[PDB]
Amino acid sequence: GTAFFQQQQLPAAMADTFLEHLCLLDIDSEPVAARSTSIIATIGPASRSVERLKEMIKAGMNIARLNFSHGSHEYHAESIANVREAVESFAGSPLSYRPVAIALDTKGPGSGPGLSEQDVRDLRFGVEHGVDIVFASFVRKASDVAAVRAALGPEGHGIKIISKIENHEGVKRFDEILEVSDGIMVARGDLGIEIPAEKVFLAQKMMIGRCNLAGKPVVCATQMLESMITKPRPTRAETSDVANAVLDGADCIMLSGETAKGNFPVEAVKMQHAIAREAEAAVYHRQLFEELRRAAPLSRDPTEVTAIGAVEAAFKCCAAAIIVLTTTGRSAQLLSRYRPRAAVIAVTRSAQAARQVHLCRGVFPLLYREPPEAIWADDVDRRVQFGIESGKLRGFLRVGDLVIVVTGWRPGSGYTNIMRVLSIS
Amino acid sequence: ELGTAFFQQQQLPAAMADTFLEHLCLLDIDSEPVAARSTSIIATIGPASRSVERLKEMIKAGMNIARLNFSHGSHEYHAESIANVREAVESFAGSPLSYRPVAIALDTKGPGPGLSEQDVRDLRFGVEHGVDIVFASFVRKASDVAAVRAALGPEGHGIKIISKIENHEGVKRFDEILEVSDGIMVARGDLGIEIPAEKVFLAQKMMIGRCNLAGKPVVCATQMLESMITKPRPTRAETSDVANAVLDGADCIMLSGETAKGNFPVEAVKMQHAIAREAEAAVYHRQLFEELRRAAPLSRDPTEVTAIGAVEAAFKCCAAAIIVLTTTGRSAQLLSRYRPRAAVIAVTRSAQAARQVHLCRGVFPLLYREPPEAIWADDVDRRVQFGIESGKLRGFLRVGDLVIVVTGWRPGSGYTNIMRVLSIS
Amino acid sequence: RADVAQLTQELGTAFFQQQQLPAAMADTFLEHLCLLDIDSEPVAARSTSIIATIGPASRSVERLKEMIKAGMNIARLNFSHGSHEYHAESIANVREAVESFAGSPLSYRPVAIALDTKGPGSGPGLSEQDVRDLRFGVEHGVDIVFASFVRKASDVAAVRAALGPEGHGIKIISKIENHEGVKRFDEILEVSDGIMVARGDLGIEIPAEKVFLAQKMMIGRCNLAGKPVVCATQMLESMITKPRPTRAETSDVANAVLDGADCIMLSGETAKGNFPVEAVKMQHAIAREAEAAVYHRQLFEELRRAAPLSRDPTEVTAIGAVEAAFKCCAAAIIVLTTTGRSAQLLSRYRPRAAVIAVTRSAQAARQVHLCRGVFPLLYREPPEAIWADDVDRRVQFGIESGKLRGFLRVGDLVIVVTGWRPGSGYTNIMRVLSIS
Amino acid sequence: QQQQLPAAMADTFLEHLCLLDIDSEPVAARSTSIIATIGPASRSVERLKEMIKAGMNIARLNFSHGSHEYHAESIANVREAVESFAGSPLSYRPVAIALDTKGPGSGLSEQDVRDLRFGVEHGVDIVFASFVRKASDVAAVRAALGPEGHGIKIISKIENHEGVKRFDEILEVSDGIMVARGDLGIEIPAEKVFLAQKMMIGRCNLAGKPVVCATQMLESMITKPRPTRAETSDVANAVLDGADCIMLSGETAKGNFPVEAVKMQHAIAREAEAAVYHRQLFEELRRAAPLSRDPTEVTAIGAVEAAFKCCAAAIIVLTTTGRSAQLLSRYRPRAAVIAVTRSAQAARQVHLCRGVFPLLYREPPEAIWADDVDRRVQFGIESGKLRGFLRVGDLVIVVTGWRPGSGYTNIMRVLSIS
Numbered sequence A: 001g002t003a004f005f006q007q008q009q010l011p012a013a014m015a016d017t018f019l020e021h022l023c024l025l026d027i028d029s030e031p032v033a034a035r036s037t038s039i040i041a042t043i044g045p046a047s048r049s050v051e052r053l054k055e056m057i058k059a060g061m062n063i064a065r066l067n068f069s070h071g072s073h074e075y076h077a078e079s080i081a082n083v084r085e086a087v088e089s090f091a092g093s094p095l096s097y098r099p100v101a102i103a104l105d106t107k108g109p110g111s112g113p114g115l116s117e118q119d120v121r122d123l124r125f126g127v128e129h130g131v132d133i134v135f136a137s138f139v140r141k142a143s144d145v146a147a148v149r150a151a152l153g154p155e156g157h158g159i160k161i162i163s164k165i166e167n168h169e170g171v172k173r174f175d176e177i178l179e180v181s182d183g184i185m186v187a188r189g190d191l192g193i194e195i196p197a198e199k200v201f202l203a204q205k206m207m208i209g210r211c212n213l214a215g216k217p218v219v220c221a222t223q224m225l226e227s228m229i230t231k232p233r234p235t236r237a238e239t240s241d242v243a244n245a246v247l248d249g250a251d252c253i254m255l256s257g258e259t260a261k262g263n264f265p266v267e268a269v270k271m272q273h274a275i276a277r278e279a280e281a282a283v284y285h286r287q288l289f290e291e292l293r294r295a296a297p298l299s300r301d302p303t304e305v306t307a308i309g310a311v312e313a314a315f316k317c318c319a320a321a322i323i324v325l326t327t328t329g330r331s332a333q334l335l336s337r338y339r340p341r342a343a344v345i346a347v348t349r350s351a352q353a354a355r356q357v358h359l360c361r362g363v364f365p366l367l368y369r370e371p372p373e374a375i376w377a378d379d380v381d382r383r384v385q386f387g388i389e390s391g392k393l394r395g396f397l398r399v400g401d402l403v404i405v406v407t408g409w410r411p412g413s414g415y416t417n418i419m420r421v422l423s424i425s
Numbered sequence B: 001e002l003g004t005a006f007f008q009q010q011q012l013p014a015a016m017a018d019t020f021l022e023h024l025c026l027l028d029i030d031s032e033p034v035a036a037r038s039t040s041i042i043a044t045i046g047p048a049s050r051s052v053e054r055l056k057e058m059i060k061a062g063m064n065i066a067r068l069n070f071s072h073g074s075h076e077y078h079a080e081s082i083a084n085v086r087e088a089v090e091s092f093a094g095s096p097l098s099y100r101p102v103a104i105a106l107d108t109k110g111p112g113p114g115l116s117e118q119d120v121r122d123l124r125f126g127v128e129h130g131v132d133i134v135f136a137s138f139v140r141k142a143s144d145v146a147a148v149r150a151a152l153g154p155e156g157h158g159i160k161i162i163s164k165i166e167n168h169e170g171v172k173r174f175d176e177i178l179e180v181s182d183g184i185m186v187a188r189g190d191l192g193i194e195i196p197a198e199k200v201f202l203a204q205k206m207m208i209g210r211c212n213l214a215g216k217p218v219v220c221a222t223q224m225l226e227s228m229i230t231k232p233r234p235t236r237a238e239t240s241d242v243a244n245a246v247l248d249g250a251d252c253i254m255l256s257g258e259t260a261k262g263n264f265p266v267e268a269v270k271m272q273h274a275i276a277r278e279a280e281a282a283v284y285h286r287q288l289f290e291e292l293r294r295a296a297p298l299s300r301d302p303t304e305v306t307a308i309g310a311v312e313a314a315f316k317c318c319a320a321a322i323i324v325l326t327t328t329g330r331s332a333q334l335l336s337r338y339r340p341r342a343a344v345i346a347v348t349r350s351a352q353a354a355r356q357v358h359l360c361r362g363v364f365p366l367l368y369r370e371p372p373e374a375i376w377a378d379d380v381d382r383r384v385q386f387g388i389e390s391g392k393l394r395g396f397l398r399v400g401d402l403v404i405v406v407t408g409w410r411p412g413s414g415y416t417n418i419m420r421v422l423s424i425s
Numbered sequence C: 001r002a003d004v005a006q007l008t009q010e011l012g013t014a015f016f017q018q019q020q021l022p023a024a025m026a027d028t029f030l031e032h033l034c035l036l037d038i039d040s041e042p043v044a045a046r047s048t049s050i051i052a053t054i055g056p057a058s059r060s061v062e063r064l065k066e067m068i069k070a071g072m073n074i075a076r077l078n079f080s081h082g083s084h085e086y087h088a089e090s091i092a093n094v095r096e097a098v099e100s101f102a103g104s105p106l107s108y109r110p111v112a113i114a115l116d117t118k119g120p121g122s123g124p125g126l127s128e129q130d131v132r133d134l135r136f137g138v139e140h141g142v143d144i145v146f147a148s149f150v151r152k153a154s155d156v157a158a159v160r161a162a163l164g165p166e167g168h169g170i171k172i173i174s175k176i177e178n179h180e181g182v183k184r185f186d187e188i189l190e191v192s193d194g195i196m197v198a199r200g201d202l203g204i205e206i207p208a209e210k211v212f213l214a215q216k217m218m219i220g221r222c223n224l225a226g227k228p229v230v231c232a233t234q235m236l237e238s239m240i241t242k243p244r245p246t247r248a249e250t251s252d253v254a255n256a257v258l259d260g261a262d263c264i265m266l267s268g269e270t271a272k273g274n275f276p277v278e279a280v281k282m283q284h285a286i287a288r289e290a291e292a293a294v295y296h297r298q299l300f301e302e303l304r305r306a307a308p309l310s311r312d313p314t315e316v317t318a319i320g321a322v323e324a325a326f327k328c329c330a331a332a333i334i335v336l337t338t339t340g341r342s343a344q345l346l347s348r349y350r351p352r353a354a355v356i357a358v359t360r361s362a363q364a365a366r367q368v369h370l371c372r373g374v375f376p377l378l379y380r381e382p383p384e385a386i387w388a389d390d391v392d393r394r395v396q397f398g399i400e401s402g403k404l405r406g407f408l409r410v411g412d413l414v415i416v417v418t419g420w421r422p423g424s425g426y427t428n429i430m431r432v433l434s435i436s
Numbered sequence D: 001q002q003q004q005l006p007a008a009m010a011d012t013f014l015e016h017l018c019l020l021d022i023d024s025e026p027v028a029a030r031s032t033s034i035i036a037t038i039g040p041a042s043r044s045v046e047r048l049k050e051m052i053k054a055g056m057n058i059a060r061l062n063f064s065h066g067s068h069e070y071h072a073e074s075i076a077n078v079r080e081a082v083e084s085f086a087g088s089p090l091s092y093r094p095v096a097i098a099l100d101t102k103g104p105g106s107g108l109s110e111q112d113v114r115d116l117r118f119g120v121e122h123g124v125d126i127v128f129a130s131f132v133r134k135a136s137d138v139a140a141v142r143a144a145l146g147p148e149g150h151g152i153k154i155i156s157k158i159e160n161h162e163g164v165k166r167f168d169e170i171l172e173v174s175d176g177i178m179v180a181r182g183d184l185g186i187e188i189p190a191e192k193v194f195l196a197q198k199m200m201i202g203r204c205n206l207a208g209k210p211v212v213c214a215t216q217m218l219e220s221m222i223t224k225p226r227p228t229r230a231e232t233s234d235v236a237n238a239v240l241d242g243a244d245c246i247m248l249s250g251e252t253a254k255g256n257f258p259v260e261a262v263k264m265q266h267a268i269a270r271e272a273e274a275a276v277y278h279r280q281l282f283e284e285l286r287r288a289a290p291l292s293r294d295p296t297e298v299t300a301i302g303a304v305e306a307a308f309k310c311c312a313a314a315i316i317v318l319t320t321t322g323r324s325a326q327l328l329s330r331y332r333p334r335a336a337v338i339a340v341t342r343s344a345q346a347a348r349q350v351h352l353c354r355g356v357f358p359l360l361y362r363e364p365p366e367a368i369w370a371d372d373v374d375r376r377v378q379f380g381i382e383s384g385k386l387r388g389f390l391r392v393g394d395l396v397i398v399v400t401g402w403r404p405g406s407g408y409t410n411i412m413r414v415l416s417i418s
């Protein structure tokens, strides 16, 4: 229908130049797709109540950040328990349940150059409490990441390390830090004090570009909706900053004081949700996909080869979704790196992977709870059907839509190799 | 890894170029072709090439399609030539490395306001003798194609109709002719008499471009190696013409007097084979694939969606082949329209489809004769392994290579929707 | 590497590490982003004009001199506040501060005066206060009018009529502040001299999360039309009370410049805030960084592809001059102009080279601040007897002022744009000159 | 519309091909020069006049055949035929004289030294140097031309594997290149010649140096009045590849249809030039051309850009050595580059550059240099109007310098005709 091609900035998406794409942007072209940039909300006094956390999950919070620069271990353990209680209150309806990751943000090393003794204790707390992600403060070189990895021990091998780049050295040694990290956070608060304030946008755009090229998650953080700590509506510069972080290519956007101590934590999450949806529809996919394809090197890994084939197939038919089965989240991450317009519905049995895939733009995790079928092919199908049924209930899919299904040839992680075109019935 | 020597062969340095101009500058006479020749050679069978022994040499030199010119000879003469082609083809039905399907094409005498009486009788002869293709002379409009189609009677609706464009009217009404035809022949001999000789190259390039866009076979014909009718080596203009027809995007190249009446029919086939191999490696795939992608409209047909995904996947890993299961040849044709560098190995149970897929550039037919397996999934596996084993035998594949496999979810033609990445064991 | 090797040996590796030149050479926008370097210092003069609202904190002659030195190019008078007497005193103080630097072309900096109207209310036509304020503007010789709540082409015709026969030279910049203005944008742009994305009211009239779409669309369409576009309101809002802005604020200023805005504005930051000079300095610092980060390769190609063919010699000469400037890394394009039009046509192709506009019109020197990258030089000398000698003196004036202001250095190449006969509308010549 | 303008507007090369129309007639003057080998079949003054009218721009003398006396008579006949049209200065066509050497045997041969000296003594404009395999071969030819042959253009013939492999060093010291396909097709596999031709044409286009496509282009026309389909395609594809010149050997030297062979190359080249996809070509030439601080180079790109913006009918350039016209030509404008020169040698040599139309200025000098420049500009306009290049109302780009003498081009002006 003509109405379909007038929504989600589709006239602007057809444009032959980026300039014509901008000229075709329409404020009356409503967003259709689900919001794909994850929202990280920092947990504090304004956001610890189980009932308030349920409202934040419904507003769109995907990752709960625990800032270990404030509070004690006892305070953060209660935060974790309240988050888990609010999250599990929706587990009774498995088709609508929303996993929420728990990220520990470290205090950092201060005047010290190595891992501080408090960071070692906080990192061991994180492993003991089952955190999914570590936002490592003031990462300046690859050996800082190795020290964080060592302090997590053998039981914290699955935790994702997102390196916070907050000073000149971190920016200059970016490539070596990215290589050993799972992702990056553009920590603009300290970065804007360590380097001239007028240069932060260059560092943000450079880091987001490099992370997009590497296929690794990148978080844009600090003062995105600062005025919403005390005011019900943000400034024009604030909404523009959120939209531009999404247009830059950020996988995640963050709220600090806006959710930790402000008077409008739920409204701040709703605002980031609303802006991100508008900005994602305004992304010029024609140039973005072409450039991501061109820049990505050749690969002999079947997961990587299947992912590019699936993204290309999704664009060819305007697929509503790519449903992928994943153990560690890696197959969903490799789909996400090509920035499909189609939602990547990741079906997993790993509760940790379901939480961690929120770091990847456009990945919608579904935690499958059913016990395995005796016939492996029947177990793969029931999981694909669970992805379809959840997608229909959540509005991602409708009867008649085309979907791309990404699976593997045998059980266990690392064997994704099949892409299939499926019609929704 | 593949090694530096791998990336110096088959014009791979020129293939990596960021502009067409840089691509030309990087062409290297020392960069040897490795891939199998993908542009089919059509040889006209006549006095100089009728004998079974001579036909065996032409099959070994590279002839894929035997053309019978019904402007000369008689039904009895052409029936003997067809029987001799079939005898030469079946002489290799033992050795798997040597059995190659050869299509039989009937070229009509031509047209009054409809089909000539002799054309009606010759078309009936073609149906009775089981020809695969009809090269229809002097097609001027869509109703000329309908008359040939009607003449192919109740038993020959599977015969491919390749319309010969030989006059101003055929060029002007090209779009309507292409729409109802299976493919096109740029019949340069008569075209060069009907329109100014200096305009033929415009008509050839236009028709090849439009056929490439439509995903339909296009043949470049007449005077390609003309001087080889009397001389053992062609002129510099002749080798250039063959190379340029391949670079233009022709699916097939033809020999007329060169093979029908000249003194060097086998040498003419060998020469076209040598030039086509060199010219295919010099194709600028980066721009070609991007432009085929951009120009091709969105599709909700799973075969078309799977084909673009499979070709994208093949480029990502430098796949040695795309093995496709096809009954009518359509799935192989849809892969061929995206011009993959990988060979498209079409595994079929149909002898007719195996002969007819020679019209599509880069399609290597394998006729499969084993009795069916009771379990359909096992029968599919048996054919995929037939394609892999034939490939290892013919040189295409080695253990450790990656191949793309294209199948459907259920038996019967028209359900292609799966693309799998396999590692050769 | 081969397309920059000879110029790299000549100008040096240090030259090609500054002003985001490695990022400028990139073959894709993604590679361009990856190559952005915080250690690559900006060298070029700041080309996006700063509009500062003059009010209680920025009114004194001494304070205004500090703001002119910090980078203010256009002084905005908000007729939603104050009185005619109050605004006349502000204008006189701006003119006194501006004329305190008139002793030499090396120290002189023309500053435009813009009147921002109160607007219509529930009425669908020009208000009686707007008619009186517009007549005040003509009587006080304002250069620009920022017309509030423009909703259709007839609104700009009403403003034009209220300016009378003596206000024909005043530029009308239509403020787009509601859904109707956005929807009827094309007809408004066609009859306006430029546009202002007035984000404060726009953010109340349409959903706040959609303002960025309207800003990017309007900037893109203005860039395509070759007409000035201003980005306004809350750019450095927190600097009204704090000496440093938020991370969202610096990002917003940089992104308005990257979007393609010709001007950026300060409202409460300079009108009532505690750091008016620091707010101007901050916009100046961010704009210089953001201009160097512009991906000129894609921008120039897209401006070329989208712009239709032209039989106007000024337009033909402008594209040739900008192409020539990119080929040699010209330090400047010196253009002779009467109305500012030849400089505006150069500016629409977004050259990296500074467009030094040499003019005798004091009003045109003030108004060309609306066009990104235009540096106005007011020529005060009486005409030479031979017109060709007069033109040559004006060209040399621009070269000597350019050398003394640091825009030009010995060994630099400059592009000179002039016409074949006197009077407006005859630009048709492009010359390549080496600086000695 | 005419001159393949619908196909020129296309957003992709594939859509450009699809839009090519056999009914879209060429309007622009033929840009690719024709080199005709002068021999027994084309030696007479009367025959040479018909070849000049058919489109011959460069006369090639093959020093592998004949004698010095034979070639001197051929040269005199060419000059006599050329000067028979000098009575009408606004339509006169300069014709270059090129000497093609016999080549080495195993260094520069003694016969080549004598033939090169003959060329200097007879005032040849170009030398097609046979079997160039390294930069030192070009230096030897240059030295054998002596101090009086400093102005002769050396076009290196690439005819073997070594010449192809050492191409970059040969191009660096040569004025241009000839893809000598006859010997190249014997020295390397015949099926690889097209790769060497396309690579060499691409590199010459990038370097801004003339490239000639030669041998067997219309071979069958030695005995037949019409060429084969492969032959017309080969000529069209050499033009589409980017060749500045196309050549005729036996077709004009010993064949039965020398005038028809020239007419055929003229007809094909005109059609192929209109089918060039300028949108991609200009952008790629621009992207690849390095940054430059040379005002002639800077003015040339500005002039070509300005010509495309207004669909200028021509770029009129004043040139002493032909260099300013060559720098315009390297950007492949659709507009004709009308080169107004006082140098008869430069007028002949500038035929090596695609799209350059030389006008030999023989009008009286004006007293004031500025007035003299303006009259040379008006001469280009009047010749253009008479020859069909220009009409009243057209826009032209005029390229001049700031002071007399070679090397000072720095001005581009936009002018409306009449």
Ligand SMILES: O=C1c2ccccc2C(=O)c2cc(S(=O)(=O)O)c(O)cc21
Binding pocket: B044, B045, B046, B047, B068, B069, B072, B073, B074, B077, B255, B256, B257, B258, B260, B261
């Ligand atoms: O002499 C021919 C002949 C004689 C007797 C029976 C058949 C043939 C025959 O098929 C043929 C085809 C071509 S062409 O390549 O189609 O032009 C010829 O040029 C010449 C003959």
Ligand SMILES: O=C1c2ccccc2C(=O)c2cc(S(=O)(=O)O)c(O)cc21
Binding pocket: C053, C054, C055, C056, C077, C078, C081, C082, C083, C086, C266, C267, C268, C269, C271, C272
């Ligand atoms: O208090 C103000 C004032 C008081 C008395 C006379 C004039 C002014 C005045 O011009 C102004 C402008 C702005 S704004 O930047 O336009 O929003 C303000 O925010 C506040 C004032």
Ligand SMILES: O=P(O)(O)OC[C@H]1O[C@](O)(COP(=O)(O)O)[C@@H](O)[C@@H]1O
Binding pocket: A325, A326, A327, A328, A329, A330, A331, A332, A379, A406, A407, A408, A409, A410, A411, A412, A413, A414, A415, A416
């Ligand atoms: O993305 P990952 O972690 O590599 O997981 C993908 C794996 O998931 C599967 O699709 C399903 O495997 P399981 O049945 O073990 O869940 C495997 O075939 C595939 O290898």
Ligand SMILES: O=P(O)(O)OC[C@H]1O[C@](O)(COP(=O)(O)O)[C@@H](O)[C@@H]1O
Binding pocket: B325, B326, B327, B328, B329, B330, B331, B332, B379, B406, B407, B408, B409, B410, B411, B412, B413, B414, B415, B416
């Ligand atoms: O190219 P075609 O003619 O549509 O054939 C493709 C068909 O071949 C298959 O892959 C195998 O089918 P069969 O087992 O019937 O041969 C089907 O799943 C698919 O529909």
Ligand SMILES: O=P(O)(O)OC[C@H]1O[C@](O)(COP(=O)(O)O)[C@@H](O)[C@@H]1O
Binding pocket: C314, C336, C337, C338, C339, C340, C341, C342, C343, C391, C417, C418, C419, C420, C421, C422, C423, C424, C425, C426, C427
């Ligand atoms: O930019 P504008 O308003 O068109 O003015 C450009 C004009 O200035 C000139 O360069 C010089 O004109 P004046 O001598 O009248 O100042 C003219 O040749 C040209 O027409």
Ligand SMILES: O=P(O)(O)OC[C@H]1O[C@](O)(COP(=O)(O)O)[C@@H](O)[C@@H]1O
Binding pocket: D318, D319, D320, D321, D322, D323, D324, D325, D399, D400, D401, D402, D403, D404, D405, D406, D407, D408, D409
């Ligand atoms: O192309 P070339 O050899 O540099 O010649 C261009 C020269 O011709 C001119 O346009 C005219 O000079 P002359 O008066 O010497 O003929 C010069 O201004 C310029 O330097």
Ligand SMILES: O=C([O-])C(=O)[O-]
Binding pocket: A137, A164, A166, A186, A187, A188, A189, A190, A191, A221, A222
């Ligand atoms: O630590 C942080 O989040 C910061 O510095 O912005």
Ligand SMILES: O=C([O-])C(=O)[O-]
Binding pocket: B137, B164, B166, B186, B187, B188, B189, B190, B191, B221, B222
């Ligand atoms: O009929 C043909 O083959 C021709 O005319 O080229």
Ligand SMILES: O=C([O-])C(=O)[O-]
Binding pocket: C148, C175, C177, C197, C198, C199, C200, C201, C202, C232, C233
């Ligand atoms: O009028 C204004 O400046 C606004 O609305 O932002």
Ligand SMILES: O=C([O-])C(=O)[O-]
Binding pocket: D130, D157, D159, D179, D180, D181, D182, D183, D184, D214, D215
């Ligand atoms: O000498 C030549 O011209 C050749 O060999 O092609």
Ligand SMILES: [K+]
Binding pocket: A067, A068, A069, A105, A106, A107, A108, A137
């Ligand atoms: K912290």
Ligand SMILES: [K+]
Binding pocket: B069, B070, B071, B107, B108, B109, B110, B137
């Ligand atoms: K026939």
Ligand SMILES: [K+]
Binding pocket: C078, C079, C080, C116, C117, C118, C119, C148
């Ligand atoms: K106002």
Ligand SMILES: [K+]
Binding pocket: D062, D063, D064, D100, D101, D102, D103, D130
């Ligand atoms: K010779």
Ligand SMILES: [Mg+2]
Binding pocket: A137, A166, A187, A189, A190
């Ligand atoms: Mg910090």
Ligand SMILES: [Mg+2]
Binding pocket: B137, B166, B187, B189, B190, B191
């Ligand atoms: Mg025919």
